[PDB]
Amino acid sequence: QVKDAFVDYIDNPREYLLSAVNTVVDVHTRISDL
Amino acid sequence: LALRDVAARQLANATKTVPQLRTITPRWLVRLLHWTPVEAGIYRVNQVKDAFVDYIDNPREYLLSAVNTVVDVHTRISDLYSNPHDQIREQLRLTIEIMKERQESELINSREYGLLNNVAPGQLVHTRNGAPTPDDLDELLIRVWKEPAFFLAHPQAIAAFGRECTRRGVPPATVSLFGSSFITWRGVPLIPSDKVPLENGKTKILLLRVGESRQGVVGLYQPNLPGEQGMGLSVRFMGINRKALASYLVSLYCSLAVLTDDALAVLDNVDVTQYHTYRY
Amino acid sequence: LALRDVAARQLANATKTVPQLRTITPRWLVRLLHWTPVEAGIYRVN
Secondary structure, eight states: OBTTOOOOBOSSOOOOOOOOOOOOOOOOHHHHHO | OOOOHHHHHTTOOOOOOOOOOTTOOOOHHHHHSEEEEOTTSEEEEOOBTTOOOOBOSSOEEEEOEEEEEEEEEEHHHHHHSOSSSOHHHHHHHHHHHHHHHHHHHHHHHOSSSOTTTSOOTTSEEEOSSSSOOHHHHHHHHHHTOSOOOEEEEOHHHHHHHHHHHHHTTOOOOEEEETTEEEEEETTEEEEEOTTSOOSSSOEEEEEEOBOTTTTOEEEEEOOOOSSOOBTTEEEEEEEEOTTOEEEEEEEEEEEEEESSGGGEEEEEEEOOOOOOOOOO | OOOOHHHHHTTOOOOOOOOOOTTOOOOHHHHHSOOOOOTTSOOOOO
16 A cells, blocks of 8 residues: 555555355265265 | 654565474485385285305284374364465474474384384494594494495584594595585494484484495385375375364374395494593 | 205295185175165255
8 A cells, every 4th residue: 555645655555365154064975865 | 854764664574484394304215215115004024044055934013004194173263364375384284394303203203113222232333442443333334234224323422533533643534415515434324313313312323234235225105095195195184174164184104124234333322422622 | 864844845835815804794685776866964864
């Protein structure tokens, strides 16, 4: 970002870290086989 | 007043290196040995008895040993942070480096196989004064007079031998191998290895003849493996657990056989802490 | 005196068989029945 918008930039810009969400899906092998 | 350096640096990429491991050694011994494949993990060494020609009825059999390591990587760490360096690739790379260091240490120091334990009586020499003088290395060269290949010693033992040579008038000759320089005595080079034990001084020096055709020392590996990332090495995917940890199995199969008993000699009780005072 | 039989046998391969299981039977009934496939595990006999 431009600071206080010479042209200066802020020295501590925000960084966005992607988050992970998980789900375990369990299926019996006889249910899928039959 | 103009743009700052830190503010401008916020827009710049850093050049990131792969992680550096300080315990990586050149591992000369593994490079110097000859490796023979063992088709199904058993290696029988037959011998002439009391060398008509008779054979011994109970030859020694070498069973290849397996060592394993489980490498766990979170799936979010490999999914998110794999640019420009693959996370799993580096994790397995460092694991395999550590495992090969352990493999060299076991080629020297194992209790089942391993040079320092499989040395025949009469092939063991002792130092006369404690420091590794040229006479001790000449004794070793007497024991393995046939076709010696190299000496194996701790780098501090090599420095002690050099100091003994400098006390005499002898500058030992030097040779270049693998782009590196080594000290030689009577044409047989001294190879460094920090895996040779050292306890309050008191290390050991080895002399080897290598090769299957010369009846020397040979290394043994398992030729065909699932995964098969190298000579006797395999990496296999184990699965993913309920916490999203992906696991990998790294397996290394190895052994070592001394074909005849005069292929290896050990100089024992070597002291590396002695320095000469030069007075003229 | 010459080379022995056991000493010479140390250099010979043995012919190893696959393990033998004595509980294997000819299982005639499975061979004699007719087998019909069931597409999704349910079979209704009207």
